[PDB]
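Sync notes, pocket subgroup
Present: LS, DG
LS reminded everyone that the earlier model was apo-only. Rerun requested with guanosine-5'-diphosphate included. Inputs:
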Amino acid sequence: EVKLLLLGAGESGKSTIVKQMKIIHEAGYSEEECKQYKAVVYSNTIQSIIAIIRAMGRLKIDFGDAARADDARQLFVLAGAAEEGFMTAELAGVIKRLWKDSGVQACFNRSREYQLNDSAAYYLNDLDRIAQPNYIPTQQDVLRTRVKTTGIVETHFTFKDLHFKMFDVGGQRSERKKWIHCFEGVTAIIFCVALSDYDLVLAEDEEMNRMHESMKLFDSICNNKWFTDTSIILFLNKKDLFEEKIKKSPLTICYPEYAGSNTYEEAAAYIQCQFEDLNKRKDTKEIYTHFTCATDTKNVQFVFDAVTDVIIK
Ligand SMILES: Nc1nc2c(ncn2[C@@H]2O[C@H](COP(=O)(O)OP(=O)(O)O)[C@@H](O)[C@H]2O)c(=O)[nH]1
Ligand code: ALF
Ligand SMILES: [Mg+2]
């Protein structure tokens, strides 16, 4: 009986790691379970297109083609069905024309300037498929869903003859007050960090850099004497989004003294060292770091397999 606790700031990938356990250790989501997320997919998709159109006003960005104005009006007239688990070929068209508009795209490419779901493009780019009549979300569609965790979620599974009890909590500031309820008998903590957060700000605070917040959290948990005997595993998550982002957005936004290049390998090791540096007992305490893509099942499988042997030692 092993107890794992998934900690980290909001949207770091904790719940997505939990979803993988089902796919990797069980048999993935059944049809009835996939259908349950159908409305979340649609809700997520409609909320993402609205967040972009909402930002265009704030940033004063015009549509590329004047006619998009009617489509934008139609969107709100029709948005209500989507939430109920319904997508009409009419609504689908509206969203598709909007998504392809150059002004909408220009706004999309300035997303660090507001709050947008990591999966907006994933879904918006796959509209034809997800809008089909009789659509049932795929395993990846489920993994891509965004649903806020509030409270404590407990999940169980068997792996390598061990019975796992995985604990997951909410990372927003207002939720952190609930973390101490899970502190008992923890075999290992899996601290999730979103690498692509380096240039974003807190949903709960536009004055606070998202990566700095994680550092504050990791420093706290890692050096908490209560966890002196718990294995600290660090997942430097969203390696796939970081890879694409490092090429165009400067890391000096987060770490002003970074003198390396806009490359993945070099910028990734740097962030690793920043976090590993917070450990105050480097000779007595070990940090087990892994770079991950929580939405990629094969990646998570090989990484979880390695993490368990560590737990098995
Ligand atoms: N592309 C990409 N998105 C991810 C990854 N990890 C999680 N996501 C997406 O990021 C969003 C937030 O993750 P979630 O697991 O809800 O985070 P929590 O708030 O920490 O539980 C969800 O829509 C996920 O599908 C990753 O490595 N790559
Ligand atoms: F934003 Al998270 F679980 F911390 F939804
Ligand atoms: Mg969660």
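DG: The first helix runs from residue 14 to 25.
LS: The radius of gyration is 21 Å.
Action: DG to write up.
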